[PDB]
Design a protein around this ligand. Structure first.
Ligand code: APC
Ligand code: 5RY
Ligand code: MG
Ligand code: MG
Ligand code: NA
Ligand code: NA
Length: 157
């Protein structure tokens, strides 16, 4: 059993309902057990043009799947929630990202863990710190509570 952390986001449709459905579906896979769920945050989009605000949260899982098995389950969940993949990025019903997988570091074409952008993302670290404050991010070797920073664009929903 490995403790892993997922980052979930939604910015189109009924965001809260889609996040809750996603969690339920994730927990229904064998090999994945959801053991904790952060509060939901409303967050301003980063890395792109002006876009609808996200609802974001983090989930703790206990898993017996390999990291690529886990990735398959995360992407299947997005398909369940009808995520659209157009030529250009845009709003999404659901995004399920693998943030941490034990203290492992994986660098494959299809998979990078820890997530390559998490240490500079308040929409990850704020909810992650709610459920994983003492977990070590293995590249920095810092605990999540030592990475997290104040950011007013992330607000409790
Ligand atoms: N840690 C990770 N979690 C999820 N997918 C990952 C991943 N590392 C690499 N990927 C790959 O990223 C591919 C594209 O996924 P998208 O969800 O479209 C990226 P995104 O989540 O919108 O951006 P982000 O990675 O900046 O958060 C997936 O098909 C998967 O192979
Ligand atoms: N429409 C949209 C859209 C916005 C940003 C990116 C770039 S990645 C990304 N994901 C998140 C997330 O979940 N929350 C927040 N707040 N910002 C994020 N940026 C994108 F591809 C598409
Ligand atoms: Mg993703
Ligand atoms: Mg993402
Ligand atoms: Na399960
Ligand atoms: Na790589």
């Amino acid at each position: 059993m490995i403790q892993a952390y997922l980052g979930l986001g939604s910015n189109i449709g009924d965001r809260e309902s889609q996040l809750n459905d996603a969690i339920k579906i994730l927990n229904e896979y064998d090999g994945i057990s959801v053991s904790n769920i952060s509060p939901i945050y409303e967050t301003a989009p980063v890395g792109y043009t002006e876009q609808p605000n996200f609802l974001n949260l983090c989930v703790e899982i206990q898993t017996t799947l390999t990291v690529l098995q886990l990735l398959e389950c995360c992407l299947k969940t997005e398909e369940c929630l009808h995520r659209i993949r157009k030529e250009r990025w845009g709003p999404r019903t659901l995004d399920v990202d693998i943030l941490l997988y034990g203290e492992e570091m994986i660098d494959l074409p299809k998979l990078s863990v820890p997530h390559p952008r998490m240490n500079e993302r308040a929409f990850v670290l704020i909810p992650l710190n709610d459920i994983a404050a003492n977990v070590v991010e293995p590249r920095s070797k810092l605990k999540v509570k030592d990475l997290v920073f104040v950011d007013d664009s992330v607000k409790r929903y």
